Scaffold this active site. Structure first.
Site: not given
Ligand SMILES: O=C(O)/C(O)=C\c1ccc(O)cc1
Ligand SMILES: O=C(O)/C(O)=C\c1ccc(O)cc1
Ligand SMILES: O=C(O)/C(O)=C\c1ccc(O)cc1
Lengths: 114, 114, 114
Positions: A1, A32, A64, A97
């Protein structure tokens, strides 16, 4: 990330260990390993929010997978709380975002994650 | 909406009220209340366009809707004119990335716009 | 195409002609005329990768087409090698986000590429 924060808050106002706190908190949040989390903080920015140059932040989180309606809300709770607590930035003056990246579109170590 | 401008133009060359002008002009343009517009200007950047380091800009506009063929062209007319007028940056040396964000992928005030 | 590099590496560590080398190398790579390539390098950043603030980079490549599984891997090979060679950044500490932009979503010279 990958998490990026842009703010008009001065450098001196970012506490020590902020990047490490962001990394830990995000690893927890995303599920993660922290060895994959990339954090980037950009202070002293020339920015405005709703016409006002009161403390604010424009950020983005690329991952992802791990991106969706319910997850993104948790992320915002978390990230906004950290910025409010650690940087004194009002959560109603923070934009984040979210980007669900396709593994083939993320390059790392001379290749992609595809 | 969120507008970000990156340019090699020096800080001293950005006129006062530029952020407010961008906010106003974009609110008009998008039909969104100015209290929602976030503007960010990053001058003195180390950049090049077509091999030349002549004044140039790399920008992006994120909006939940208000993005499409016809609208994007209006935006470019406007944004390029402002950069050409206010920053003396030739419109043929400006790139603007348009992003139609999904409400669930934009975080704000401890949640998302979903 | 548009390539952006963010790194914690100091400004003094970016060699002269790096932007021109990036432009040339990317033009070759993408098969696009170098007059269209935009490069942006942002050094001295406050960032971390996997918890460590060892030299690292967060970049992105926006292109209208020329983006896919096989191409992205070539790009990563190339970009990572340049960062490793020119900036001494270990390729396993570099992230590159790939973006296949729709022509109507890229503004330039008072309009879009649509
Ligand atoms: O998303 C992930 O799981 C990951 O491991 C890495 C990543 C890093 C940067 C980026 O822009 C997107 C994904
Ligand atoms: O687009 C809008 O109408 C909006 O209100 C907010 C917004 C905030 C951040 C962003 O990256 C895109 C849009
Ligand atoms: O893709 C192209 O052929 C091009 O000429 C330019 C371009 C510029 C900015 C961007 O975000 C994507 C593409």
């Amino acid at each position: 990330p990958m998490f990026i924060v842009n703010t008009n808050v001065p450098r001196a106002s970012v506490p020590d260990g902020f990047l490490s706190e962001l990394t830990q908190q995000l690893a927890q949040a995303t599920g993660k390993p922290p060895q994959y989390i990339a954090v980037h903080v950009v202070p002293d920015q020339l920015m405005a929010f709703g016409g006002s140059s009161e403390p604010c932040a424009l950020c983005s989180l690329h991952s992802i997978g791990k991106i969706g309606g319910a997850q993104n809300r948790s992320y915002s709770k978390l990230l906004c709380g950290l910025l409010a607590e650690r940087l004194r930035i009002s959560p109603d003056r923070v934009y984040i975002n979210y980007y669900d990246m396709n593994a083939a579109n993320v390059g790392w170590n001379n290749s992609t994650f595809a």
